[PDB]
Every structure is written in C-alpha cells, then in structure tokens.
Amino acid sequence: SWAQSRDEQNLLQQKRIWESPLLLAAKENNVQALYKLLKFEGCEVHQKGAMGETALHIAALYDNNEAAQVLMEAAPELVFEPMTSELYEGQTALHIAVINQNVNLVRALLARGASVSARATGSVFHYRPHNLIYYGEHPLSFAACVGSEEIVRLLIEHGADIRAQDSLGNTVLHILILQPNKTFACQMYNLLLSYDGGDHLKSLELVPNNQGLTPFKLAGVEGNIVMFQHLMQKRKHIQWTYGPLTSTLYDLTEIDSSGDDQSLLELIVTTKKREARQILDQTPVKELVSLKWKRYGRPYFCVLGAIYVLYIICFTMCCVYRPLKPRITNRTNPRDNTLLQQKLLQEAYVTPKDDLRLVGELVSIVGAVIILLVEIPDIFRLGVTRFFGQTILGGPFHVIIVTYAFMVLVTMVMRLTNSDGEVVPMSFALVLGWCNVMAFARGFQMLGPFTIMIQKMIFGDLMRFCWLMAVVILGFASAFYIIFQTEDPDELGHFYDYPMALFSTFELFLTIIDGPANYDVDLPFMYSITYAAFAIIATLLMLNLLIAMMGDTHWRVAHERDELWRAQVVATTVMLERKLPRCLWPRSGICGREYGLGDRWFLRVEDRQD
Amino acid sequence: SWAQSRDEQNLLQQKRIWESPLLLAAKENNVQALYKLLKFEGCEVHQKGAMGETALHIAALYDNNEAAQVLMEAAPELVFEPMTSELYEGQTALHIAVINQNVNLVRALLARGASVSARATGSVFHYRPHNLIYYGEHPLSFAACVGSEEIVRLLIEHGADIRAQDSLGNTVLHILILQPNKTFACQMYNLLLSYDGGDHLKSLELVPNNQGLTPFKLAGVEGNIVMFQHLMQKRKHIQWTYGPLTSTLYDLTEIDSSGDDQSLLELIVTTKKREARQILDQTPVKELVSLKWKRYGRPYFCVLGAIYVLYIICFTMCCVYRPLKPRITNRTNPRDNTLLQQKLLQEAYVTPKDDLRLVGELVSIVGAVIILLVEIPDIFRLGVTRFFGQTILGGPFHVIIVTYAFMVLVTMVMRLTNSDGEVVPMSFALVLGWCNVMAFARGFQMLGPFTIMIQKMIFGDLMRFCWLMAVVILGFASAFYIIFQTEDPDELGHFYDYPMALFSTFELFLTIIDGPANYDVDLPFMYSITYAAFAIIATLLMLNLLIAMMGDTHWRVAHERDELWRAQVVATTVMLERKLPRCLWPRSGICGREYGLGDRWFLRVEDRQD
Ligand SMILES: C[C@@H]1NC(=O)N[C@@H]1CCCCCC(=O)O
Ligand SMILES: C[C@@H]1NC(=O)N[C@@H]1CCCCCC(=O)O
Ligand SMILES: [Ca+2]
Ligand SMILES: [Ca+2]
C-alpha cells in the first residue's frame, strides 16, 4: 500500500547513505573524511540522495554542525537547495535546522542567506490522520510549534512574515491551535502577536482560514479550552469591581448567531468533535445558552409539541373510525381460517358522521405539504450531513417524520384505488407518528437524558447484537419445526409452517408465551429435550446482556450523558432561532449603540469569587 | 424583564461616566484634571450620575484615595450624600469604602463625620435569590461580613451600634450566619460580642429575628454546623474530668420542644433546607432524639399501628360479607355478556349474622369522625405547608387517609340510596386503607429506608416517565386495533373495542399476558410484523429503566437515604410529643430546680476521647 512505500523508502534512504561515502561521512560526523572527499577527490558535492536530499540535508537531520559547516564552506549553494522527492518536496536545510532547535546552525544558515519563505509542500507535511505532526509549511511555523522562542524572533529578524499562509490558508496562529501542548502554546501565541502592525484592522487574529474560520473561532470548533480561555481576554471588558463582585462585559460578536454560519455556536453543534461540547459550558457561552432556552426557547419547543400531538391525535381519530367493512364476497370456504370483513371500495358515503372524517383527512395533506416544505429543503442548499448537522427540527428521530408524510401520501394513493393492502400503509404512520412524540422528551425534564440511552441503543449496539440473537433462533426455531412437522398440529401446533416456526420461537426467546405444552397427548421425544436447552440458553443471553449494560453507568458517563443531553438542548435552541422569524426571539444582550462603546451586542455577566 | 433592566443600567452608568468629564476623571484617577474642572471651571460639583451617584461615589467604587481626597477638600458635603437611584437608595460613600476594605479612606471619611447609621435600602442590598451577596444595610454589617477586623472596631469607635437591625430585623449577628466563609466568621462573631454591655439579659445573642428566630436558633435552621458547634460552647457545662472520660452538661433550653414553636427541633423537621438534617446528628441533639424514640416513642408508634391495622382489618370484614346479591331482574338478554348478580336495595335484614355487620359499620363513622377531627385541624390554625410541614400523623402518605374517610362517608351515602355504583366507593377504601399501612414501615426496622425509595419514586420520577410510557402505547395499541378491527373477534379478540385495545396492549407492555396468539386461524399479515417490534421496544425501555435506576445507589446516597429515614423518624417523634398529652411522655433531661444551678432542664452526656 502507501504505508509500505514510506517504510520502504526510509529503509532505501539508509542504503543510499551507506553506499554514498560522502553522505555517510556527513551522517557519521567524520570531518576528516569530508575534506578527503572534496579537496583531493572531486566527489560531486551536489550528490542527490534517495529522497533527493543533499549532503547538507543529512548533516542537518542528525545534528552535525561540524560536518554541516564544512559543506557550506566547500559549497555555499547547498543552502538554497530543496529536497526533490515527493514526500519531502520543498523542504530546505533551514527547515531541518529549526525543527531540531539547532540554534547555532540556524544562525549560520541565516547568515548564508537562506530563504525564510521556502514552503515544504511534501506530502509528509500535510494535515492528515496518518501524519503524526502538522507544523505548517513555513520555517517560522516550525519555529513557533517546537516552542523555541529564541528562533522565532531570530527568524522574524531576517524577514519572516507572520501573515504568511500555508496551502490550507492557515496562518502560524491557526497552527498553534492544532497542537497538543496547550499551556506552552499560549505564551508563544502572544509573542507572535507582538510583531503585528498595531492597527485595529488587518490584525493577524482577524485573518481567516480558507473554510471561513478565524483563530478565535477555530479554537471553539477544535475544543481547545486553554486557547479559548486565553483568547477571551482580548474581547472581555470589566465594568467595575465592588468587593468580591465583578461586573464584566463580553463582546459576544463572533460568538453569537448574527453573522450567518460564521457563528461559533452553530459550529459546535454541527461539528463531530466530542471535545467542542465542553466549550459551550464556558462562562461566556453558558449564560447565553441558558438565557436562550429558559426564555423564548422552552415555550416554543412545547408549543410545537402541543401542535404536533394535536395533529397526530386527530389523525389517529380518522384511522379508528375508518371505512365500513361488511365483507361482500363470503368466500370463507377457501382458506376456511380466513375471517376478513374488508372496507375497501365504497368511495365515501352520505355525510353526517362521514363529513367530519374528510376534514380530519384534509389535515393529512397539510402535514404532507408542510413536511414536503421540510423535504424540499432536505436537498435544497444542504444535503449530506449539512441536513443531519442542521436538522434540529426534531434533530434526533425526525428522519421518520418525512417517511410518515410519505406513508400519508401513499395512503392517499391507497385510497381512490381501494386496494387490499389498505391497512399496511395506514398502520406505519400510527407507530411512527407517536414514537416520534418522544423526540419532544429531549429537553423538557429529566427524561431527556433517558431518551439519549434508548436513542443510542436503537441505532448502535442493537443491530450488531440482534444478529447474534438472530442466530441460535435459526438453530432452535428450525429444529422445533422439524420435531413438530411429523405430528398433528390441530392441537399444540405452535410451528405449523416455517414462517410461524420462527415467529413462535422468537416470542419464546423473550418468554412472552407460556411455551408450547400439551398434556392430553404425548409430545415428541425431542421437544422435551430441546426445549430445556432453549430455556437455559435464552436466560444466559438475557443475563449477560443485562450485565453487559454495565459497559456504561460509570459516573463519568452519568456526567457524559448529562453533557450530551444539555448539549443537544443547546442544539435545539440554535436552529429554532434560525428558522423562526426575526420579529419573535429578540437577540440576546444589549446593543453597543446608544452607549457608543461598541456598536456590537454585549452580555452583562457579573460573578463572585470565594 | 428585570435582569435586563439592571444590565441596561450598568451599561447606562458607564456612558454617563464617559460623557461626564468630572465623573470620568474620578474613575480614571486623573488628579490634575479634577483641579481644572473645579477651580478654573465651575463644574457643578454635585453632579448626579445615572445611578444618582456623586463624583465621590465613583471615586470610592474604583479605589481612588487621591481622587477621593480632592473631592472632599473642594466640597465636604459630598460625604453625607446618599445615592438616589432605586437599586442603590440609601448607600453612602462610607458603604463603598468599607466594602473595598479601603482602610485609609474609611478613616478619612469618619474624620469627616460620615454617619455610621445610614441604611442602604436599595433593592440590590435585599436578601433575594437573584442578589449574589447579602451584607445587611448598615456599614458595620458590611465591615463584619468582609472580615476586616480593623474596620469593625474602627467603626464601633465612632459610635457604631451592634444592636442595630435591618429591615428584616436581623442584627449583625444574624447576617454572619448567612455567609459562606464559616471558619472566618466565627472569629469575627466573637469580636462583635466583646462590645456587649455585659449584662446577662439584653445580650445581643438573645435579640430575636422578626420571624421569631435568634442567632443560635437560626444557625440550626440554616444548617451552619460550624457556627452551631461554636455557639454551643456558650451553653454547655463540664461537670468533671476523670481520665479520658468527661461528663458534660448541656443547657437544652432553646433546643428542646417546651417553648412552643420556638423549639429548634421543630424548625429542622419543618424546614425545606436539606442542610439542616446534619444538625440533628450533632452530639447534643443526637442523644436527645435517640433517647426520645428508643423509649416512649417507638412503642406508641407501634400501638397506633396495632390500632390502625385492627381498625382496617375489621372494616374489610364488613366488605367481604356485604349485602345479598340475587339478581331480581333477569335482564340477561340485553348485553348477553352481562352476568351481574347485584346486592343493592334490601335495607338490611333480620339480624343474627346481620347484626354484627352493623357494629362493624359503626366503626366506620368513628374513623370518619376521628379523621374529621383530623380534617378540621387540616385548615384550622395551619394550612398551606404548615400542615404538610406539621403532619407527622403518618407524615408521608396520610393525605389519603382523609380521602379514605371521605370514601367511607360517600359509601354511607352510597348506602340508604342503593345505587348501582356501590362497589366503586367501597373498593377505593380497601386499597388506600392497606396501602397506608406501610406508612408504619417508616421507622420500625430496615424497611423504612426502603419505603423512602418507593415513596420518592411514586411522586417524582414516575409521573414524567409514565408519560413516555403512555406514548408508544398510543402508537402500538391503536395500531393493533386497526389490524384486528377487520377480523372476527369471537376467537382471539384482544382488542375488540378501543378502550380494550389500550388496556390489552398496556398489559402486554409488562408482558403479563401470553400475548395474543391463535394458530387455528391465520392472523392478519401486520399483526406478526407489528408485534415483533413491540416485543423488542418494550424490552429496551424496561432495560434502560433498570439501568436508569443506577442514577442513585452511589454510596453517598446510601448514606443520604439512611440520613433521610432517620431524620424522618426524628420527624415522627416530635409531633407525637406535640399531640400527645403532657402526662404521658415525660420531658427529657433533669430539671435545674432542686439543684439550683439552672431552673432549666439539662441532659447529662458523658463522652470518651481516644
Ligand atoms: C526522510 C527525510 N530525509 C531526512 O534526512 N529526514 C527526513 C525524515 C522524515 C522527517 C519528517 C517525518 C514526518 O514528518 O513524519
Ligand atoms: C452600580 C453601583 N454604582 C457604583 O458606583 N457601584 C455600584 C455597583 C454595584 C455594587 C453592588 C452590586 C450588588 O450588590 O450586586
Ligand atoms: Ca411471564
Ligand atoms: Ca404467561
């Protein structure tokens, strides 16, 4: 594959280093050898290694200032030389010297005039899961990441540009946010800002990423709390300090949802990173989301539920009082078991009690069109995750609400044609319409976190486990059929045909029925033996499942599911504000006009320190 | 709303500070500016800010002794000036100087003759949940709360009054008890007591709150153990010290229940604060309550149960041997399913076996009147929580005991009228009369804590969850009805009408019935499919509930429910002593007369230190 390729080439490089006597001597710091290979013998100083590296590139990898200095003295054009291989296209000797924090070699290379604008476009410097580190493409980006404050200023002194962006359009500021050592990177972040021009506009912090993000905004998405906390000092203003109390004012500009999708809050709820959830708990955001749902948010969510419950409960009223079913053809004799009395083809009737039934069915096309006005913007504008990431209209579940309206439309087509299968399209809507009601259990009270468990269980662990429950049924259900195939099924015929054999055993797996048992007639010899094993094995599987549930329930998951529910409540609040009109739901905070301090909206939060 | 108002005004204040050049210079400590605004230009020194603040009020907020001193020198009448706004009505410059612990400014203000009796009646100084801190209304109250021992004595030296009460009638002593830093406040508590007159009477500790509480008494209600422990030294007397043993005598005056509702014990069991429960565990109280229930308490509780069980079991005897039911009208044919043989209108009968039935019914009016003598004092004197806080007659449950007597009275009205619904009023009393018997399981042995779980479950989590169980039934129960509406219900008609469809599915949710299944006749196509989903979903909901139970069971809750039960046993003991006559249940302890040490009752408790 591709992992083999890079593993092959690192091995292949070492052979070239061993074979090449010049490259070997630079690797091994043999100073006396290098003079013998350059002065007396005319070895081609511009020797190209396996990775297109120069003799100086190897002397920089393994820190070798003595061997590196000889190469610059004998040939000074090697400093500008970049590596030519695909994995390392663009990398220069200065990149290697900065990475290893070789201060004396960096100073010697800059004195030679090495470019501070050379990009390392090689694939190994790309931001990808297989790459272990991402340091950008510029030598200043490398210096800032390793934390050598000495080299960062020294690189700037020779003309390094902080505004320089990589292929992804990330400045050196953006690269620091995507780093493990958060505590060290904060101090380095400040140092790079000191070289900013000083103008309020064109500030490097305002320079955006290619995908529209900014350093402050990116920190929230990536879940870097340390940088998020540190970056907040820029945009928070202390009003006054009275004893232990402190009224502090927050800028609330890039945080709030006014700037279209540039809102930080939308990025948190849409992103897949679990880490970003902790950002909404932070003290500028936590008041914002709480004030959002406690007032203007919670009522509208319940109002929709009241409308939704009403819309559903009326639709069921149409189903229970459905067309008349008198059975015109008394077939009866063929399949004498058959008992049907069917509704079907009467094309309405005279309308006293019948009149109200049409007004209830007229509500179906409203939902069929309102949800069609939900399904039209189900591929319009958005459409891959951008719906599943934007869907807050229900959010969880509510993929089935659009299928429900399809069943409503199919049941309309089921009418006016009077097909036998009238019940099957009408039946699906009743289960799905009420099962979706518990989507409103999200938020509400303390059943919301409960609905998260079952929601997870339905779509995750069940499917895999259900396969294991599907097996063993195949063994026992088909077995029982074979034993009972011989005997007369008139009495105790739990498995008369194969589709009933599976269904009867499936019921038996959850012990719903009493279990097949007749004492008037003697049963087959094998039923008594095979059923004993079925009763035991079914209990073990249920006990082990019950014990397997304890895979969760650790106190951290009690905090986890609590944070997941409250995060999904915040999720509900944002798109409700998005779809709803601007006249309702006034913007949070107070405007910075009429007190000419800002021209933006500020949240006044006061706190107390114990 | 109102939170917006104060947020608006803090923003509005800063604009006035910026706009007002005088107020700005005091905020910014620009000393050179202040002289330019007062000497050369005649700026109206008595400038009123947005909050009615003076230029000195701003100079005190932000600690600005240099700017504050200039304002007093140019205009000395600003010191007496209070803020006029509603939020800050009454606050003076001395209040602000004390709060920020500006010692030099407090000394300068007192030298100017600032009042030490000025109250801060502004709404932001009220004791309310929205206010973060409560420091009282007097400048000495502020000094004591921040803990500046230097200012407290200095404020007293210039005529501060410790006896001064706020609008709620709380002294400075009461304010300290309602503070977070319990360990610091104890030392400050003593310092304020040193300035007391020294007379045993009129002591500031005896000064009561408006609602009848005193500092020692309030500490128990508020659950401040540190202050409760510290305050106990005042009223505990060591008899002797023999080796490691120590006989210490406790005053037991304000603690015990003799002084009407002033008893501390009644305040603990009646209050809603969870913290007060730990106070009853304290070593002066724990012996008192234990000695109370172990002797004189536990027997009377069981004696009432023996009487109650006897009263109930006889009442059931009347129900089982009820009027004769021969069915006079053999209607039968209309609703041929009907089978009734009804008792109804015979107006008693000749009395051999019948005579004893009346003597048992005569017991019903006794309970109907005895509980009427419980329902008459169910609005008399008390009545909102003052019953639910005073009810110990059962305590938990025993709201239903008064409804039981109502059903007894209704069943009496059901008799002498011979109505069809004879069973329905009589049936409710049997369930409620015996379900109330487990109220006596409170206390008793180790089932008492068990009864607390179910008691909590019935009235808390169930109702919310039951709604979620009510949903999904609507989908499946109504669905099953539709499938089976077509077919002949003579055989396997679990859902023949809609009210039976819900009830049959509700039973099926808990898997009580075998589940509808017939093999002689072929079932509808949809029943087999829809029932499979019902069996699965019902199990998940029950499994997730079982796992959701683990929301408790942490070892802290095992201590919590144990402390809740033992606290509710203490609850039972207090009102039993209240309702019972004084001749029974002698007062705990030994009187201080006949050993003229006290004239009050003392509990002799000896302890040993390891
Ligand atoms: C092979 C290259 N040639 C060399 O002399 N050092 C390089 C080794 C890899 C450094 C970058 C590895 C990475 O980014 O994952
Ligand atoms: C606004 C008032 N004017 C001022 O100069 N300081 C005050 C600030 C509020 C102090 C009390 C806040 C509180 O009690 O919650
Ligand atoms: Ca069973
Ligand atoms: Ca059964």
Residue numbers in the entry:
A (entry chain A), B (entry chain A): 28 to 637
What do the authors of the reporting publication say about this deposited model?
TRPV6, a highly calcium-selective TRP channel, is overexpressed in endometrial cancers, leukemia, and carcinomas of the breast, prostate, colon, ovarian, and thyroid. TRPV6 has four subunits that form a transmembrane domain (TMD) with a central ion channel pore, an intracellular skirt domain enclosing a large cavity, and amphipathic TRP helices that run nearly parallel to the membrane and interact with both the TMD and the skirt. The TMD is composed of transmembrane helices S1–S6 and a re-entrant pore loop (P-loop) between S5 and S6. The first four transmembrane helices form a bundle to constitute the S1–S4 domain.
The strongest increase in potency of calcium uptake inhibition by 2-APB was observed for the mutant TRPV6*-Y466A. To shed light on the structural basis of this phenotype, we crystallized TRPV6*-Y466A in the presence and absence of 2-APB. In the absence of 2-APB, the C-terminal (cytoplasmic) part of S2 in TRPV6*-Y466A is splayed away from the binding pocket by ~4 Å relative to its position in TRPV6*-Y466A2-APB. In turn, 2-APB seems to glue the S2 helix back, perhaps by virtue of its tail amino group interaction with E402. Y466 in TRPV6* is highly conserved throughout the entire TRPV subfamily. In turn, a more loose binding pocket, such as the one observed in TRPV6*-Y466A, might cause reduction in TRPV6* affinity to the S1–S4 lipid and, as a result, increased affinity to 2-APB.
